[PDB]
């Protein structure tokens, strides 16, 4: 473990004098109650107003 | 000294078959040679002889 949830392990050398390392991370996301998350959809970002 | 009257001389066979790689310039990612050192299966053995009277 380097950082919590991430690890680095040495694997060996592959007859070409090249070493390899394995870097792995495990993660997930949990929602305890349905009313803790909401999404607003269809948001246009290319509209502009005029000031005369 | 010889502990029990027998002396065995172990020798390497085919020293020219050990392969080494040396680069002249601009090293690459080519595979390296794989080798080992071989021994003689019937080495010469010396046993002490007596001079007595």
């Amino acid at each position: 473990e380097q950082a919590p949830g991430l690890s680095v392990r040495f694997t060996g050398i592959n007859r070409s004098a090249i070493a390899s390392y394995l870097v792995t991370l495990y993660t997930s996301l949990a929602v305890l109650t349905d009313d803790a998350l909401a999404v607003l959809d269809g948001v246009a970002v290319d509209q502009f107003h005029e000031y005369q | 000294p010889v502990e029990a009257g027998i002396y065995r001389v172990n020798r390497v066979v085919n020293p020219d078959r050990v392969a080494i790689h040396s680069e002249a310039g601009a090293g690459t990612e080519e595979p390296l040679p794989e080798t080992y050192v071989d021994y003689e299966t019937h080495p010469r053995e010396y046993t002490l002889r007596s001079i007595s009277t």
Side-chain angles (χ1 to χ4, degrees):
Chain A
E1 202 171 57
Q2 308 307 125
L6 183 125
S7 64
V8 179
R9 276 172 290 204
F10 177 74
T11 79
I13 306 168
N14 76 333
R15 303 300 90 52
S16 299
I18 289 153
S20 284
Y21 297 84
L22 173 64
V23 199
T24 324
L25 177 124
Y26 304 98
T27 194
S28 200
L29 197 72
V31 192
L32 301 181
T33 40
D34 291 336
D35 67 354
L37 159 78
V39 162
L40 172 69
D41 227 313
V43 181
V45 286
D46 66 323
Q47 273 174 0
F48 286 83
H49 284 289
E50 319 80 13
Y51 299 80
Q52 294 102 9
Chain B
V2 178
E3 73 142 73
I6 315 277
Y7 198 72
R8 185 192 288 161
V9 179
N10 284 306
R11 275 184 185 182
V12 172
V13 286
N14 300 315
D16 57 287
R17 275 185 210 176
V18 181
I20 324 284
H21 178 254
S22 74
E23 61 194 40
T28 62
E29 282 171 2
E30 301 302 301
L32 291 193
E34 267 160 315
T35 38
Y36 67 99
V37 185
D38 208 358
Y39 306 155
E40 161 75 21
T41 50
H42 292 92
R44 167 135 200 212
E45 265 168 325
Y46 295 96
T47 172
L48 303 173
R49 308 275 177 227
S50 87
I51 300 174
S52 52
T53 206

